[PDB]
Every structure is written in C-alpha cells, then in structure tokens.
Amino acid sequence: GRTNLIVNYLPQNMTQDELRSLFSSIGEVESAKLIRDKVAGHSLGYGFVNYVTAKDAERAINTLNGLRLQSKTIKVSYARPSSEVIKDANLYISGLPRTMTQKDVEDMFSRFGRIINSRVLVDQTTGLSRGVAFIRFDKRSEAEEAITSFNGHKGSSEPITVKFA
Numbered sequence: 001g002r003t004n005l006i007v008n009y010l011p012q013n014m015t016q017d018e019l020r021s022l023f024s025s026i027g028e029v030e031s032a033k034l035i036r037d038k039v040a041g042h043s044l045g046y047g048f049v050n051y052v053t054a055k056d057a058e059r060a061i062n063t064l065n066g067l068r069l070q071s072k073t074i075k076v077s078y079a080r081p082s083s084e085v086i087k088d089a090n091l092y093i094s095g096l097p098r099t100m101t102q103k104d105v106e107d108m109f110s111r112f113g114r115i116i117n118s119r120v121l122v123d124q125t126t127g128l129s130r131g132v133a134f135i136r137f138d139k140r141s142e143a144e145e146a147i148t149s150f151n152g153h154k155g156s157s158e159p160i161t162v163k164f165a
Helices: 016-024 054-064 102-112 140-150
Strands: 004-008 029-036 043-051 075-078 089-094 115-122 129-137 161-164
Touching: 004 054, 016 029, 016 043, 016 054, 043 054, 054 075, 089 140, 102 115, 102 129, 102 140, 129 140, 140 161
Parallel strands: none
Antiparallel strands: 004 043, 004 075, 029 043, 089 129, 089 161, 115 129
C-alpha cells in the first residue's frame, strides 16, 4: 500500500508549489519535494509526492502519469516498486491496548529487530486509538519472532494477534 510516488520529466521551471498544488488536486498530500541543485538552484526535474492515503496515490498515478506539460510528458509512478515493497518485514497487529501510542507500540516490539516504520490506526467516529496497528521490520527474521512471541497474549479481555500483512 504505497503512498510515495516518483515524478520526472517535470518542466524545468515548475516549482515545488505547482508540483504540490497539482498533486493535492487529486488527494491530500503529506509532502512534495522537487529535486534542486542545492548550490545552483535549478530543477533537476525529479519530484517526490507523498500522500496521506494510498487511495489518492493510486488516484494520482492514473490521472497524472502521462500528463502533457510544455511538451514534457511527465511520468508518475510509485517511488518503491512491487519488487521491494512486496518483501517488507511488515506485519498487522490487532488486540493492542487503546492506551498505547506509536512510540509505545514501537518500543514494545523493539526487542525483535530494527523497526523501519509503524502506523497506529484510530477510529473513524470515535477518533481515539483502535488497537490495530501496523509495523515494519528491518528484515523478515525479526518479524517471524514477533509472530512467535506475541501471537496470543494477555489484565485485558482479548488476546493480541500478530501476523504478516
């Protein structure tokens, strides 16, 4: 479920602004970067657009890849491809307590390997923590361990589920 996309063949004078604006128009953007020569200032014509939702990221590619601009036919594609993302040491955890927070959940799983990233899910109406979370590990072996170490647990009502996504 990638949110990061790569853009290039961007017109030479397009600005980090026109980039963002042009990508926001499709969804809601976390951050957009235009790659500039730090010293000389000019656009190297690479763009990184990060969405909040994957939905909108998939939406952006469909609508914006191939967009004709100043004869520049820009290319929108997922920053990470299906070659690498598909091998992420990434697991779904339900059953977690509502009091835990991204960091809390992170530290409690520290003990298995290098935690690349983590997202904790909140409720739609209620808004506060849900007990479901996602966690990415450095390499697979660290995740297996969580699965073996935490799949089933405890004074709470339900057992915690750990398994690959």
